[model samples]
Target: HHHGSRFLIRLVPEDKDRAFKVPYNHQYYLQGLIYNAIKSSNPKLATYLHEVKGPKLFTYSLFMAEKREHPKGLPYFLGYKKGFFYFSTCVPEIAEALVNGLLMNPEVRLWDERFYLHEIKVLREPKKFNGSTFVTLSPIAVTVVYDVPPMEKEFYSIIKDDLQDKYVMAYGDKPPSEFEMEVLIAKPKRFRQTAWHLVFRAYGNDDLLKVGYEVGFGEKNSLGFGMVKVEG
Candidate 1:
């Protein structure tokens, strides 16, 4: 499980205003925090995170935005009251390295201001969802993904393609899918932008679903595109 340990953490910001709005694609911002924390404890892990690519063992998320709005005035997150933000990762070593790193250096810049790590609540993954359907943990984006937005089936095909190497590495050979995929168009608000706040559906294994949960759903997951959650 390279960076694939899969753990979650809830952080209560010291200042609500200082917390800043968690936007669509804020993965870049969150990545910085986690990378710094990991680097603090073990630069080796940091190097692995930076050096790795394809079947990207790196996927993480920012959750619990109070509300979201579009500046075009619809679905994009405008701003909201502050609360705890959840950050989770598919990479276990990175998570462990982050924890160890944070133990020594507990301050991180949230909303661009330095916020001390006051209280961190470690979370468990969704304990076997009715787990069939899942929604984006980070809004799914295909903007310029391979330089184009993906059609629903194309989206899943890419997901399957991305996971192939890892799947083969773990088991052997690319698993064939006779199952049909259903895309639940999420966020009419979502389609308005470069992302899809959508959900994916079909019958499958909880384990594979969780792997998707950890690795991410589609392109740019490392940039925060396809982390998903079990949808009721």
Candidate 2:
């Protein structure tokens, strides 16, 4: 079995004027923490760390200060589950785009920002980490069967066709391919039991294409495990 784990550490937006708020530096420190943590807990995964610098989608600063007030420092982490995973950011519309991508293309590796939006929504409850205040992004880590088969292009194509109109509206004039579409469709289900809470807004420049995507799961009373109008 290929025993491994994917770790993501998101820092609370830093004061840009402050020396400590540099995204690169913060990413470095968080990456170190993740490496050390995994080395201690699951040494095997330490060897498989695949680091990629993704596009900056939303500014935590804008999301927290202008959109909503955050308690303090909160680091978000998400893990894969049963070959699938889900995530929700302060940006809801971006999250929905990601959900759409996953469903359309099961083999997509990395996600972009256009799918995410900048919004302010506080966690109902707070969590503490190493004496620091923050929130644990839901679905902390996912446990999947290591030996799963690689996704096929044919399967992904079908999902893209299934979700085409939704993607077009969510994305506007530009359309995504079957490969990209899979990323939206494969989002894992959300933990919420209600439906009305699913509609979310997106953030950032529309021309930058990949900067806004975010991933979220389904809630009750909403679409209920089916497709809905991209705007609906």
Q: Which stretches of candidate 1 lie over 4 Å from their true place?
A: 1-5, 15-25, 66-91, 126-131, 142-152, 169-180, 188-193
Q: Write the per-residue lDDT of candidate 2 for residues 91-173, one digit (tens) a residue.
A: 34333333333334323222211111212232221221112111212211121321111143443233233334333433455
User: Where is the poorest 10-residue window by lDDT in model 2?
Assistant: 56-65
- Report the C-alpha lDDT of model 1 over 34-133, residue by residue, as the tens digit: 6777888999777876787665555665545455545654322544443334444565666678778767876566544445565566755766633267
Query: lDDT value for candidate 1?
Result: 0.58
**Model 2 lDDT, residue 148, Cα:** 14
Local accuracy by lDDT, each model = 0.58, 0.25
TM-score against truth, every candidate: 0.73, 0.20
Q: What is the lDDT of residue 161 in candidate 1?
A: 56
